[PDB]
Amino acid sequence: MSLQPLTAVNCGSLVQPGFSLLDLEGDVYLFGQKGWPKRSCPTGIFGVRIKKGELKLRAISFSNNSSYLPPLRCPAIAHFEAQDGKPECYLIHGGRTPNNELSSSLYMLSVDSRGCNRKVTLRCEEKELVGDVPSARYGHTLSVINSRGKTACVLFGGRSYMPPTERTTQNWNSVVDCPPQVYLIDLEFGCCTAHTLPELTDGQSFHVALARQDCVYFLGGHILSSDCRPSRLIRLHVELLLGSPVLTCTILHEGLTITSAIASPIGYHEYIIFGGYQSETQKRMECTYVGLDDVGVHMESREPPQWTSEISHSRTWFGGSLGKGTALVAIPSEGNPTPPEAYHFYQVSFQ
Amino acid sequence: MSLQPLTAVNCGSLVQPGFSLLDLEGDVYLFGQKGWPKRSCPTGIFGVRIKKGELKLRAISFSNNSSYLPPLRCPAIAHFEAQDGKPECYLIHGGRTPNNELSSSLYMLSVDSRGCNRKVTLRCEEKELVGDVPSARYGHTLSVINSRGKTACVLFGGRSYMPPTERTTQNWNSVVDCPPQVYLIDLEFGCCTAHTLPELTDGQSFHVALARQDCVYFLGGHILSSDCRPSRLIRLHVELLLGSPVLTCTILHEGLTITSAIASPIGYHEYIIFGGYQSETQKRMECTYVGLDDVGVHMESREPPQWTSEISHSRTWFGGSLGKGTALVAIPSEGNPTPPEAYHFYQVSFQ
Amino acid sequence: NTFLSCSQYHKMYRTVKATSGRQIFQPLHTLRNAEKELLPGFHQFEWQPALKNVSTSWDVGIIDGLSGWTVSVDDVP
Amino acid sequence: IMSISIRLEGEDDGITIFQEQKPNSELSCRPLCLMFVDESDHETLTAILGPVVAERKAMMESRLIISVGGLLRSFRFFFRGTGYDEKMVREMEGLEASGSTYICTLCDSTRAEASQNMVLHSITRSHDENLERYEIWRKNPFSESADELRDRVKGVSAKPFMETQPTLDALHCDIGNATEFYKIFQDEIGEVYQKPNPSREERRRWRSTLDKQLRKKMKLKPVMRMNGNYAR
DNA sequence: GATCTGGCCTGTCTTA
DNA sequence: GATCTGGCCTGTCTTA
Numbered sequence A, B: 001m002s003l004q005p006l007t008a009v010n011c012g013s014l015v016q017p018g019f020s021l022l023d024l025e026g027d028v029y030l031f032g033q034k035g036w037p038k039r040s041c042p043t044g045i046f047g048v049r050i051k052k053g054e055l056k057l058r059a060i061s062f063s064n065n066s067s068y069l070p071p072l073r074c075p076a077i078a079h080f081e082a083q084d085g086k087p088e089c090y091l092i093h094g095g096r097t098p099n100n101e102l103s104s105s106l107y108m109l110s111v112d113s114r115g116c117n118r119k120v121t122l123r124c125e126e127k128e129l130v131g132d133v134p135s136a137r138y139g140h141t142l143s144v145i146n147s148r149g150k151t152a153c154v155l156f157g158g159r160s161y162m163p164p165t166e167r168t169t170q171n172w173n174s175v176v177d178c179p180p181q182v183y184l185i186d187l188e189f190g191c192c193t194a195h196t197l198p199e200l201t202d203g204q205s206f207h208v209a210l211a212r213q214d215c216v217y218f219l220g221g222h223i224l225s226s227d228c229r230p231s232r233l234i235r236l237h238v239e240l241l242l243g244s245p246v247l248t249c250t251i252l253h254e255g256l257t258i259t260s261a262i263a264s265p266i267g268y269h270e271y272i273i274f275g276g277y278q279s280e281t282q283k284r285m286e287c288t289y290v291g292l293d294d295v296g297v298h299m300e301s302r303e304p305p306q307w308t309s310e311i312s313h314s315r316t317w318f319g320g321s322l323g324k325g326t327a328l329v330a331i332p333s334e335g336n337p338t339p340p341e342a343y344h345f346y347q348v349s350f351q
Numbered sequence C: 001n002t003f004l005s006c007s008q009y010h011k012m013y014r015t016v017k018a019t020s021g022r023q024i025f026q027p028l029h030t031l032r033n034a035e036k037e038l039l040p041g042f043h044q045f046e047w048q049p050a051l052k053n054v055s056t057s058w059d060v061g062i063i064d065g066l067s068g069w070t071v072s073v074d075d076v077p
Numbered sequence D: 001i002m003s004i005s006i007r008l009e010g011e012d013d014g015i016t017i018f019q020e021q022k023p024n025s026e027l028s029c030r031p032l033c034l035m036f037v038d039e040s041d042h043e044t045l046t047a048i049l050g051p052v053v054a055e056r057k058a059m060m061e062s063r064l065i066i067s068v069g070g071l072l073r074s075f076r077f078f079f080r081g082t083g084y085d086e087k088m089v090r091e092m093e094g095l096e097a098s099g100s101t102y103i104c105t106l107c108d109s110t111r112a113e114a115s116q117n118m119v120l121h122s123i124t125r126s127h128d129e130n131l132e133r134y135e136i137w138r139k140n141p142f143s144e145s146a147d148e149l150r151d152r153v154k155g156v157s158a159k160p161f162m163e164t165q166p167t168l169d170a171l172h173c174d175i176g177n178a179t180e181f182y183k184i185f186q187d188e189i190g191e192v193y194q195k196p197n198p199s200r201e202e203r204r205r206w207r208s209t210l211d212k213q214l215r216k217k218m219k220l221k222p223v224m225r226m227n228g229n230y231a232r
Numbered sequence E, F: 001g002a003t004c005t006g007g008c009c010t011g012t013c014t015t016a
Ligand SMILES: [Zn+2]
Pocket: D103, D104, D105, D106, D107, D108, D109, D121
């Protein structure tokens, strides 16, 4: 549990407050960037390598048969693990276009070929959704479930702009919580079903969701109706049978009151919740550990690495998970003139 | 005849429009630093070296017995050749300090010891003048004559500030030509006599003086009273016969119309004149050759090197003689942002 | 139109009234209500058909451009 | 407000009434929105300027009713966006700024193509065509590599959000042409068609003597970036 | 070929 | 150890 300060020697203006780190086939891919794609990298997706403290970003190129993606700012990432037939899949939906809009299309990202010389080619495919499509939204969560024995996805939460009739050019950039119904999405085909939640009378956003063996556990998430960050934990159980995807749910008494947490996998099913926001002013410093079994969540606080004064007094912080019990965090910086590197970077490692 | 541009490597901000190159013992010494002596070189004098186009300036250091010199702008330099007692001397008198006042003190500069590792030590002795001292002036000329067999110096010309009767804080910064009387100064002691002659109607300034075999030839000066640049050549003939230094003069037919010329010795007594200006507005472009002997001055127009468009369209230009058929010329340079190097430099070579 | 600051204009008004006034210039508080016609959000107007996604209130003055941003910390600030 | 005309009852394209006699004056330019935002970043600019473009795009349709001169009268509006320079027009229409291969904002000619052929071109680019071309670039129906697909949409890789009329700025055009001719004169002081590889110091010396000459005559002093008065 | 020393170079401190 | 290619780096060009 130690933190190494990294230097973003070159290309430190591409990272932004909200962004994604996709961990597939070893190396990690940064996804999301300030502004539209520049010709230095006509795709939008960078490869990340951390070596000797240096943070190095390399350009990635798509394949011939793949469509292209706008740099979605705060999308919902779901890691579809290796199985038949195309590992390793990432389901992205749906985020915020850098031209400020909401995109309701689902993307599937995968790896294609290599190298020749340390080069990875990717491929993205839009996945048409016949629905009953969930309204465009950002900050929601998607999670993959395997049940007897087929694969589906559960989509829940998030915010969206005011309904299309009531949005006034004065309440334009206003945003309210989308209604609380769970959407079951088949990977293929695009049949997406909507189901109501008798126990959940409100939606939320920025809640870390952990899915294990056809069970989904939703940690706390910020509610904008009452401005409360509920400590309750939410469990739901998807039993996929022909032909009605019945869904049940229950409440757990206690869980961590946390929003926008960096959920880094370490063990087989053991995660560390790395921290985030517990109140609108104070940020979570304590690192927590969450083991997931069919009995339930087992939660222990672990010794948080000693933070330098800068990251302890910072107003806000964000980041993502580089995997293998390692995570990346960023702190915005001040000065005069421009640093110009607006973000100092730290790499935290476990064990 | 050839010219090569020189790169003004660091510390080129110590060259000002008026300055001197004292050529003694191989390397030549720049003198007349801009501003007061900064403690980067607490002496004020520099050794200059020209190698593969680089003009590099090194900081000379005085000896223990020397009195120190203020960086005069345009003094009268007289090369006292190598003979008894202490060869070889440079007589500096008198110029004006970086505060606008006139020195009126004769200095004698000599060499002391070397090296070890490419180092040369100098020494400046201020020498008192009893008299009948010459009035403080700048731009005049001092020349060295050897007459049977005593060495004497002839001092003539030069502007001065207005006398302390009409001196008015509205006419403070105005200058007027000093009265035209030739001063004969002994190297030792400081007994100085003053003589007047009818043929010398008004004094001059910036007129190159040549001296050989107890004869002095004055080329065309610039008279500020009638604003003329006389094309008359002047000659005076002195002899020190106990106990008077008796002096006579004569006018010649043709003398060049140049003021503030660069007189470089090339032969035994043959000089090449680069010239400063034909008229107030239009500078001189031609290069001329002036040999001199017991008969008289012999003039010859030699082919001037092809000038770059810059040095041909320059308003003003200055420089000095590195010696041995080599001379250094400077052109003020205009640009924005400030280069900051103000003076671009050329090296001209004869044969 | 003479680029006179409000405080400089009040200075001019006080000086021109205290000497021989017979005051000419008007005080500040009557200017502050004098321009309520020149600024927007005064005249009545109406579109037809009614505009899309724009409110019909015709008296909205200077509105903050953020346009209802949910300043809460976790979003884009 | 540039001009206001009358048409009714008909038979005339227009009958103009009021035409701004001094359009470029600082006295006729009505501020609408002020922001403390950078131009480079896109997310903040578009999030603030969303509403303005939205109600502008919604205003072109309906007709206004005002009580003027004693009576109730009806008005239509035509909007012409022409005051942006090239940097902003490129970045707010999805093009690539600013030294791309695809030079023209109004045409599809490339940098090398408009070097051979100079004077023959026809205006093609428009807003709706660029929206459709961003759609082609994102959907990618024929599955081309990056370079071929970039060639098919003639360089539309970002969705345009503001609409801009296909015209030319005057002021920055004059400034660009005067900087081009200043480079031509800086070239002609020396001899560049005889000696094709001049050194950096020679460039500095040529610019210095050109500015010396242009100070002796025409009474000009150099500038770091060239404002319009130097061009005129 | 070893040695020695002057001058070159770079980083920090000070007022601006 | 010989071969190769992706990507790093550097200089000029373009509108600001
Ligand atoms: Zn064109």
